[model samples]
Target chain A: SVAHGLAWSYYIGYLRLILPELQARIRTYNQHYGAVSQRLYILLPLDCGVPDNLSMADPNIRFLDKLPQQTADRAGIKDRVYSNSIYELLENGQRAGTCVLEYATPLQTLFAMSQYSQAGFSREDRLEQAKLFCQTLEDILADAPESQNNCRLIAYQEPFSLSQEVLRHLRQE
Target chain B: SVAHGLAWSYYIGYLRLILPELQARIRTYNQHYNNLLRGAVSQRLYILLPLDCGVPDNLSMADPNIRFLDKLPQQTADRAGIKDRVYSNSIYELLENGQRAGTCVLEYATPLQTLFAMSQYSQAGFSREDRLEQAKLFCQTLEDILADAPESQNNCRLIAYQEPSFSLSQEVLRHLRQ
Candidate 1:
């Protein structure tokens, strides 16, 4: 009975969580950012699992590639994923155009945990998971090439906490 | 060489005309709308806002028809409805009248600012009693239009720098603070 209750809670919880997350993103753009940054674009994954080679060629769109799967799956990356590969486009010191991608899974998880109506997961468990997910996204971006100049990752989970910290490591340019 | 000169003239003319038109929109939004709406960011606004002004084009500036569309404010409203591909005939009409007379600048206006603009429309050139009635009706229509806006744009707030209204939801206020 307890297990069934847990399963049911999760089922109800995820459905309720999706709208507010998307809504929060829209509000964030509308109020906070003034305009959706032309720099930002959501990358939808073509296949499941992590791509071993960031250097792999995409036949469809020459500028597309899969994000690192290990970190993406662990961060709860499902259908649509975000990752930046603009650095990979630079060939032999020549500018061949650019592409950048980023993910918002951590923000989604944080909002999910805050819902009062759904309490399937313990606060402590969710907090720890949220922290780890944020850290992993950061680590993944840090290790990617041209991360210093080409990529940006913003997570708006914590409010009124730290502006610089929340936006740290994100290349605004 | 003649072709090159003509092409250069066209390019230069276009560049000059586009900037001033954009500048005019920016100045209008800041001075008139009090920056309630954001400045034009999307190409959609650039296309939509300029239709009313009918700024000079590659052809002679004497061409009046090219400068402004030949339509009633109501007709302008209907066309904008089709052009923008959004619901709310009343909202579009209010916006068009405002634009035509340099009154309703929607460039970066939020839903709240749009409502505020509509309220102003009621007071203009009307008696106090009529204005009061119009304001009430405007608010009602604003509510209906917003309720019908696509879910994607439903939660959008004013981009201007100002204190939160008591009427705003706690969710909005929290976001404003952050």
Candidate 2:
């Protein structure tokens, strides 16, 4: 299922630049999105000009279906990325910038811990703010898109205090 | 999910050539051989190929999950590969060439299916052996290690069959699109 407008554009652009007649087909299909080769996304993380621990081959490779239980000790919280263990990244110092993202493998633990931890915050307020943060992220990305969009996409950077606040609320209650 | 080598092979080799690197990784990680993605395997015809089927961008496009209907339905099976449906290839067709080979999606499926659908086997002939062959096709397609064993190093995601019977479990994965 290699369909996605933006991704199709990338391949179409590459192919169109090389194959002439394909330009018309590219244009025709350009407007209509189709699945892009997902295999390419596997390659993207590796190809991105950054040194990182994330790898497609890793057993703990995160995705929709794998669920985030592979590296973590916790039990089932199906489809929740926050429960995932970023122990490798954090212990190895691979997680730079902030920490983990709002919905990433580690966020769940932080989300849970914030309730009783020294950092006490009202869950209602945290979640309301989280909703806004997510909306603003989508809005900004739509308004000013960039290559970093993909990083934001997979939650490359760890979440800041705002995201952490939400996680604490999510787990606290 | 890709860690299960056989499923990885089935998915990667689904359309074209199996990547040599992928094949090698499967061979190396013979330890983690839980074929098919980490989830329950259901008895039903499913489309592993990703299909948007007209969902909006935020809708979170569907990937392979189970289709609850009992007995593989007709219309649902029609999608894919011009000549054959996805189920046919997964359960039967693709398994044909894996007769003697060590790796193939068919090989994996046959052994796994013995648990559920074996009784449904037609009385045409030696159902056990026949079914085994079929499973091998599904397995061989994913078990590229026979052809492309890894040499030095590289972690790989793979799903090897934990059971002895073959089931059309990987068919559900066809829903994952790039």
Leading candidate by lDDT = 1
Per-residue lDDT of B1-178 in model 2, one digit per residue for the tens? Answer: 1012222223322222223233332333233432443232222222221111111111111211222111111111111111111221111112123321112221122223221232243421224434344444434434453234342112222333233333333432332110
Error of 1 at A126 (Å): 2.6
Tell me which residue pairs clash in candidate 1. A50-A69, A83-A101, A84-A101, B37-B108, B37-B109, B38-B108, B54-B67, B98-B104
Name the TM-score of candidate 2.
Answer: 0.20
lDDT of 1 by residue, A31-96 (tens): 642132223322212111112222342221233332221111111111212122221233334433
The 10 consecutive residues of candidate 2 chain B with the worst lDDT sum are B74-83
Against the true structure, what is each candidate's TM-score? Answer: 0.20, 0.20
Q: Please, what are the lDDT tens digits per residue for candidate 2 over residues A1-173?
A: 11111122222222112223222333433345421111101112111122123322232322221112111111111111112112111212242111222121112212322343322323444343333333433343353333222223332233232223322322332
- What candidate 1 gets wrong by more than 4 Å, as runs, is A1-106, A113-119, A146-149, A154-173, B1-178
With candidate 1 superimposed using the best TM-score fit, by how many Å does residue A20's alpha carbon deviate from the native?
A: 28
C-alpha lDDT (0 to 100) for residue B28 of candidate 2: 32
lDDT of 2 at A148: 21
